[PDB]
Design a protein around this ligand. Structure first.
Ligand code: ATP
Ligand code: ATP
Ligand code: ATP
Lengths: 403, 372, 375, 396, 399
């Protein structure tokens, strides 16, 4: 899918808001308040009707992907004892799906009544069901490429029957917990370790009985090509800056995943710096979902998949020299995916053009605005974008500054 | 939101009944088993649609707020020693909703099918929804006035050892319709709200004493407390001497009252009559204050609506019974009261145009007539 | 287990009070705030040790069954606008426990220390324990008679929409289950009475189908029948004459409910009847089924011959003035051997009672109380 | 469903075995480690496919309901001192699925290759499908009779409607091949049944004029109680004087039995062994009643099927071991019982044709033969010595 | 410890009962109703005060180990509407806590009040505390052997940091769940597998640096002695009848325990007969507790330990040829243990003398008796015992 515009009425901290998104990358910036998380949560709420069109979502019954009563706006008046609600709360999303079907759907809630969806939201659910039914077919010969929907929150580090080849399952399992706020690192490492050990054992039984190479040669090829695809994506981000590359599984290291550096050798990933582990988590989260969704590519599943990814605090635990490389690395690893990210770093903001930047501001009554920066930011020194866009002086207000 | 006339057909003990109500006070007088609770149940069933037009009604668990199969009249065939169920049960109400808006609505049930309402009954829900919509509007010029709606049955009583932070919905005007027609006790709701009032007021006092450096919120809180306290005084002070209900931290964070000869004592340690009368009056008063903030000091004296009281004279001694009706008329001069009793002392100095004596026939045809 | 005299010192509103009780019925008459509930609470506290001498008392959760710091009288000093607490609070009771056994016992509390009792209270507990031991004996020749002990406060009321057997519920001593607590005891009676009726109907069905085993099985049927009719007559002594309703019974046709009948009206469940009828029926049944359970060997004079003390607060709730003129005599007729102590403020309840049964409660400006017979 | 012959080869401990069963009752007799649970598990696997398509048993997928790699026989050489994993595992079953409809099916497994059944077993599966669809109808003059499949193992001893619907009818196949029968569940559901029946009896006492109000769900209850009482009477009424197990509110809210001289006695004062036997018989009768409503009280006396019992004499006094087999025969005269035992008091009351002595040579050439002596009416010592070759004199 | 007599008053199904126990083996027989489980439960309740003085007690809150209200007698009379209890319920035990000192302690409960113990029960707890504190001090030259207390119920098969050498723990862990009614085979298998893997890994480590042989030779020896004793005990029961022996742990069989037969090779224990599994469970349950309680015996912990073992349905899942060998096998593997067992098998009853047999009979009012068989039972044909002690004719009542 793709989202081109969003409109909010009486949502958490916005009386009214209209925001448009860039096709490839758009960065949200907010000097103060909680506007960015509000926008991300609204977008993540607007995408749930599609995921509800898959019975795999039966595994998720979270009471957080629908509008709640506490999401409505409360107005406190200093001179009144009573405090009322603002009703209704509306989320209106304009976008494109089917690669040619433009649409505009809406969700709303009235006070304490259950939330109500309009017709086009049900149509989005139905379009989600069409893909499910067309994928479950066995006689089908035409191939189907599913879209990707992922959410990466700020709590993606706290909480820290496998099947790869095509099937009814193993393709709808790429939508499991795809919009949750918890960490999803265990279900990646288990899958990766199972894949590695099963691939090695398949090769073992292959050279043990070469006569049975009728179909045990293509299977090994697929299990190898998936690993290649994942490793290339991870390297694209880690290698050129830190030197570590080729995430691998080594039974020797107490059944634990490890990486390798040209000079420091092989070390477990669980004992590297915070930034590298965070980056690996993000890129793996995207990549293994991409591969599990489109096995029929098996070498470019990370280079031709389409969808939307939401990232809060993209450059967390990264030093400035790494903050000038994250965005382009994400673009290069996933060239046909929409990214919506939040950031604070002036280093990041100097690596994108002013058309990919939204600055959020709120009025005294709650009216919101999402504007573009007047000045230029592409290829500029950090101190220039620090004061032109964020309004922060580069020379600290030390005692001697007054003179 | 006056109600003027009521009609019943095949309801519990009445084959048919017609009753007319007085604008301010009407008293139903009859012995046990004559149908005094039946009339009040019919009235609250007729009034519930308006409340159904609100969000506070989503938490109503009272199963007696809808017509039930047990409400259909049963006839005893003595020859065959049999009971036969007559159908349908019907409740018709006539009245006025707002200024210059007269209406007639109807409720019905047949056999064991779910109950049914007519066309004009849904417009009552629509009016409730429109009022709720108007209250929730930012930057409005016109004021909205809300009518009071309350049912005080025998479930209100405070017996021995009953011992019956605020949610964000408890700060709304419409929280005045929370369990307003249910068969329940509503004392703890009031106690929490009143304690919050007193603690905020004391906070403002402490700040304006310590470091003078806002001034309208204190006035609002003070006026609210004054309204509620005067309402309770109107009933308790003259007969018993206990006047001023307050929140006290010295007494282990409790509600207390004062006496001139006796000192300051918690409300839970006072007698049955005191506790029940105070709960009864407070139940009306704090809702009056919450529903219409803009009056600010005449909230109890100027609010309109309907209050139903079953057995208004429970736990009150004969000298107290001779004052209850006038005290209620003095505290709330603009409310329509419908009350039931069987005690003659409650009627000592009441006009004959406010009394309805209830009677039936051998076939169950009822009458509700003024005394001669 | 008669009680004859009561004394109070520094107890709630009374600085000191002496009151004497009549052998059968005593009525306390006064307005609100005069101390009618205080006297009954003091009697509860004086009687609770005997019940403490039983196992059923192990499940008592009522915190008002012991003297509390809130029961100590407070004096208001108007000059200083102060409240000062008097100490100690004291309760003295005189009476007779068994035939030819007169006693005087005392309860005390000072300040905020735990309450304390004297020796005779412990002897009362010991008597209770010995009675329990005698009841739990196999192959005994002597009979044991148990006294009734019950408190019916305002917590008994049956308001709108207010409303398998354990092996201990089949004991005689289960007649002392929550007998002095501030609670409602309707469900106990309902469950046990339903069990009675179902067993009786089982026996009827069996004797209709296979008339071959009514020998030493018919005696049990006789006992059940006699118990049912005792309870039914006790309830009839109060409702039939004024209201016309009678013969409470279990009905499976009416969705397995307790039901009453009327000559002009039909047969209707008890939960659909009026307030006065429901409350009067609950009040009388509460005494009747305990009378039946405590003394199985009387078999149909259980209510007519049992002895004990019953305390009733506001005996005339929900009853109209023509019903109030009959309550006292109805209670005396149903239970001729029980000592009743009741409170009221309604004159109609005193229409035809002797003046030697009335105690008017008065106080002076300093808190010294009197409970005097009317002139 | 009836079986007439079973053949095995390369199964757990049998290199090859051929056993022919009896029409009504057959008892497998052998000492420990002689292939009795083996034969019962083989028969249990053989009859599974008929259950796989009943819309309630197509949910349960137990590893014990299909052949496993551990069932493949292992040979010992004694020279290399290693265990040879033989293959393949084979089961071939011969029986009848309906009136005069002979059949023969087979199942196999090789190494780690998942076992693959023949299409002749899918014939049985679709036969079960046809039966379930035929019963699902609500209008037909013909009456559909279902068979009872039941397996009670050595783990049998631990852990609300009789409508003629397609749900209650198919409740008879609930865990039928992994069934358990203890006393607590039995008393629970029997008490519920009796309470529901007494409600209607008392209602008819109070208001005789309303006889016709009910009677669809009531006759079901009455006749089910009659059938269960019949079966339990067949169990207990001869050895002791008890009969007519019943629920009594008067007698302490308990299940009781009646004795012409001793009166009523509660069921909870009996030994824990006889209580479980009563529970077993009652559970079989209740399943029979639920399966075939259209008999309503002879459902137990006219249902057909196969019941497998391992250690039929478990936790039974030597007095009760002499009447269990005849009681089971008298309570269900149209069922095929296959039971395992090693007691000599169990075999002292049956005829030789039912007895099956199991043997196995040094390789696995299993035999299942008949005794050369006699057992019916014989004393315990003669049965011991002749059948089991165990001297009645202890070697002190 | 030892128990010589027991007396019950107003317990579950006995108005009163007196029963004496043989020094080595005593068998309870009851033809009708309950009563054997009642006696076993009473004995198991009379021993809890000892285990209470070891910190492995009602902290875990096994409410079954104290007298409960449902354990009191309850008399139903048909001609009375009421039903009272019989109070109090008393259990009186006479025994010997150690060689030389006899004792008589009592437990009782009155109606619904909490159960009450006399002085000697507290003294028994104090003796347990004495043994605990003496065990916890290693600053001593002389050793003391702990006593064994075990209970094996009928539900012992329903749902079938390791430290061996001496320590503060590893000796008080032999009292964990020693009187519970659940199955305790999982912990045994875990401990046994840990012991075997440690033994093999450490004898492999010996090959690496034999310099520490003097310390790694004794330690390994320990793990090689315990095993031996355990195995021997098992082989005393499951070999002369079936031929299997030498219970072992082998990772090559998917890391599960296996046993060996001369002709059938090595097979996992999970796929053997029911009788073999039951017997192995019982004997292992006794043996590993014996070894964990007295390591210093170090080769005969299963041959010199003392204590009491209670077994309900000892001969369950055993064929008659094996029912003539169980009792002597138990006596041979554990020659200094007291055994109290229940059976209803004539084969078992013919292998013991009439002095070791108690027949339980109950009166109409609940009075109980535990008598001895009048006739002889030692070395007699099965039927003689069948109709002499149990009153069952050997000729079935066929048509
Ligand atoms: N379904 C029914 N059919 C016929 N009569 C009924 C039915 N349900 C109730 N009744 C009778 O109608 C009477 C109505 O009495 P109700 O309690 O309403 O009046 P009241 O006694 O004056 O009031 P209260 O004492 O509650 O203040 C009930 O007492 C009962 O006798
Ligand atoms: N600790 C105390 N010290 C002094 N006075 C007290 C204290 N506690 C309560 N009181 C006063 O004593 C009065 C006793 O009145 P009480 O409730 O006992 O009698 P009543 O009104 O006749 O009874 P009821 O209405 O409950 O039938 C209470 O109302 C209260 O005013
Ligand atoms: N895969 C196998 N290969 C070889 N022998 C096996 C295999 N599985 C089990 N066995 C042997 O088969 C025998 C199992 O006997 P079985 O399970 O039939 O018990 P049973 O004692 O005859 O019956 P019951 O359980 O009724 O007492 C044992 O000897 C066991 O060693």
């Amino acid at each position: 899918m793709r989202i081109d515009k969003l409109s909010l009425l009486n949502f958490r901290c916005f009386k009214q808001l209209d925001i448009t998104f860039d096709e490839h990358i758009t960065i949200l910036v907010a000097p103060n308040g909680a506007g960015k998380t509000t926008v991300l949560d609204a977008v993540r709420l607007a995408l749930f009707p599609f995921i509800r069109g898959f019975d795999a979502s039966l595994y998720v019954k979270d009471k957080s992907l629908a509008i709640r009563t506490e999401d409505l706006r409360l107005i406190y008046r200093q001179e009144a004892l009573n405090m009322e609600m603002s009703s209704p709360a509306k989320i209106t999303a304009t976008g494109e799906w089917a690669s040619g079907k433009t649409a505009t759907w809406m969700l709303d809630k009235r006070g304490e009544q259950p939330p109500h969806e309009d017709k086009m939201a049900a149509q989005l659910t139905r379009w989600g069901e069409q893909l499910q039914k067309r994928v479950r077919e066995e006689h089908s010969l035409q191939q189907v490429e599913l879209p990707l929907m992922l959410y990466l929150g700020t709590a993606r580090l706290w909480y820290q029957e496998q099947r790869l080849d095509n099937s009814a399952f193993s393709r709808l399992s790429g939508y499991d917990d795809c919009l949750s706020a918890t960490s999803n690192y265990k279900q990646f490492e288990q899958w990766y370790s199972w894949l590695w050990l099963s691939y090695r054992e398949h090769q073992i039984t292959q050279l043990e009985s070469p006569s049975a190479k009728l179909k045990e040669g293509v299977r090994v090829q697929r299990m190898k090509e998936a690993i290649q695809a994942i490793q290339q994506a991870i390297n694209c981000l880690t290698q050129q800056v830190t030197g570590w590359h080729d995430l691998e599984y080594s039974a020797s290291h107490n059944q634990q995943l490890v990486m390798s550096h040209p000079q420091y050798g092989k070390i477990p990933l669980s004992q590297l710096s915070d930034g590298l582990r965070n980056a690996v988590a993000m890129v793996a989260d995207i990549a293994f979902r991409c591969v599990k969704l489109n096995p029929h590519l098996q070498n470019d599943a990370a280079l031709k998949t389409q969808g939307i990814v939401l990232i809060d605090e993209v450059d967390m635990f990264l030093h400035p020299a790494w903050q000038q490389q994250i965005i382009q690395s994400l673009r290069s690893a996933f060239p046909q995916i929409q990214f919506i990210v939040t950031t604070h770093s002036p280093q990041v903001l100097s690596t994108v053009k002013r058309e990919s930047i939204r600055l959020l501001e709120q009025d005294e009554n709650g009216n919101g605005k999402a504007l573009m920066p007047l000045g230029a930011t592409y290829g500029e020194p950090s101190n220039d974008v620090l004061q032109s866009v964020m309004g922060v002086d580069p020379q600290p207000a030390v005692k001697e500054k007054a003179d």
